[PDB]
Write a protein that binds this ligand. Sequence first.
Ligand SMILES: CN1[C@@H]2CC[C@H]1C[C@@H](OC(=O)[C@H](CO)c1ccccc1)C2
Ligand SMILES: [O]
Ligand SMILES: [Sr+2]
Ligand SMILES: [Sr+2]
Ligand SMILES: [V+3]
Length: 324
Amino acid sequence: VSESFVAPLEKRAENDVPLGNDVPIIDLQQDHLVVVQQITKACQDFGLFQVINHGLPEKLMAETMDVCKEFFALPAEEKEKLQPKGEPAKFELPLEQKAKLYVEGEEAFLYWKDTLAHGCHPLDEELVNSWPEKPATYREVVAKYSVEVRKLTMRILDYICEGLGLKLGYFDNELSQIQMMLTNYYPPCPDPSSTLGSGGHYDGNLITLLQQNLPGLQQLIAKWIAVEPIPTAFVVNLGLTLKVITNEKFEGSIHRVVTNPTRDRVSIATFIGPDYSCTIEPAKELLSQDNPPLYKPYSYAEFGEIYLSDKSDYDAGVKPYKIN
Ligand SMILES: CN1[C@@H]2CC[C@H]1C[C@@H](OC(=O)[C@H](CO)c1ccccc1)C2
Ligand SMILES: [O]
Ligand SMILES: [Sr+2]
Ligand SMILES: [Sr+2]
Ligand SMILES: [V+3]
């Protein structure tokens, strides 16, 4: 491959990463308290779990994956319409909510990935008119998907509230006001041993719901494991923001994506989290002399600038705000 895509030796994935047999798969149609308890345990112990029987229509999940795949099948002349000044946009602030194609990377290198990203909340004519024009059904399908994924995310955040002992709706405010949808395209890679689809990271936001049909997602436990694709499930990744607000009672998910030499892969990730104007701190309701705050309050915008630029460590974004 082009030297642009060659990862530093220490970041390259080993060829045989084992299945994560201990990744929790949580049935949301169990009894209410069982769901609260299983989500709580997964959040405390792993920070990454899957949800099934989650109430989001399977048909809609399939239609959304279809229109996302159709988008990435569009010819170059249509994709150029989402490349500002003739090249993909960068993940840097300000992160605008209009649809763009993005490039991402970090011994500088690029991730083997094309990403379409746009905001989803609140839905209005102005936002949806800034979404892709093609395929014709993208706007109708993804509007419905974005509303359903938000509804499911807020259900999971309220299960989390009950598990933590926070009032229901604790996160139904400025802490969840940004909803970015990223559709990721990983074309076949001639040298998977040298490249990464996505470098190891925490999601910087509050919570992310990821939809996948094919292997490539891996989680850091020391050891990397493979997250089994369940096409009708969502993968839930807890973000650095939730790790801070819970005072590290919950784990954040550290995960990466590897390339494939023979087939393409499309994933859909919905990133819910604070507005850039938000102040992030450990929830005061949970703090005590036995549970002192491990972070000072900080600007989400200030965090975001570091998080998007500094990949010296997974939690480089929050290192400046660590206390006690
Ligand atoms: C693989 N990369 C990682 C995660 C997704 C993707 C793009 C970038 O993350 C985001 O753009 C999200 C959007 O909410 C974000 C932006 C600023 C602060 C917190 C979170 C970095
Ligand atoms: O991500
Ligand atoms: Sr339903
Ligand atoms: Sr437009
Ligand atoms: V991620």
